[PDB]
């Protein structure tokens, strides 16, 4: 039809984090923008820095609107994350392409029957090694969590020999073991 924008299943919110406003973690979160079409996603993506050009200590988070990008949210507190850990050199080679693929997985509803279990994703730019993660709502749904992990691994193009792990947020927040691996 040409003149109609292509709507997303969900409205998404993009958040930025930098540790330069407050000594309390959550007061450093900024809501950047919300979008609910493919066209509006790309308009936003085109305006913002690549993750590799952010100062160490910064995060982007993309979460379904209504879910705050923190453990304490009702939809994250029983949940967990699939974690991708990058070495320092992968900031250059893999970080930006992995983050974009992650964004496309989310907005495109790429987890078929288990897409509702996905809450969001987070990229941490860190001097010790960058991290990307997909956050899901219930760490005890073995079927949903494992399916999501397998989709994610396939979409990043990681070979069978590379193993990724899922951690519950409850475990991450306690002073971490994997609940699942794929």
């Amino acid at each position: 039809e040409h003149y109609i924008k292509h709507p997303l299943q969900n409205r998404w919110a993009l958040w930025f984090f930098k540790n330069d406003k407050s000594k309390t973690w959550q007061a450093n979160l900024r809501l950047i923008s919300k979008f609910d079409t493919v066209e509006d996603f790309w308009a936003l993506y085109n305006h913002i820095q690549l993750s590799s050009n952010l100062m160490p200590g910064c995060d982007y988070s993309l979460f379904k609107d209504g879910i705050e990008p923190m453990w304490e949210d009702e939809k994250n507190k029983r949940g967990g994350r699939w974690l991708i850990t990058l070495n320092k050199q992968q900031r250059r080679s893999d970080l930006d392409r992995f983050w974009l693929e992650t964004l496309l997985c989310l907005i495109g509803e790429s987890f078929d029957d288990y897409s509702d279990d996905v809450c969001g994703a987070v990229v941490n730019v860190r001097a010790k090694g960058d991290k990307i993660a997909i956050w899901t709502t219930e760490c005890e749904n073995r079927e949903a969590v494992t399916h999501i992990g397998r989709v994610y691994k396939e979409r990043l193009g990681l070979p069978p020999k590379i193993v990724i792990g899922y951690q519950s947020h409850a475990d991450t927040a306690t002073k971490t073991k994997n609940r699942f691996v794929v």
Partner: peptide, 13 residues
């Protein structure tokens, strides 16, 4: 109902 392939999303860029 709204699912997009990788291909589709990139084309729309």
């Amino acid at each position: 109902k709204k699912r997009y392939s990788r291909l589709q999303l990139l084309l729309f860029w």
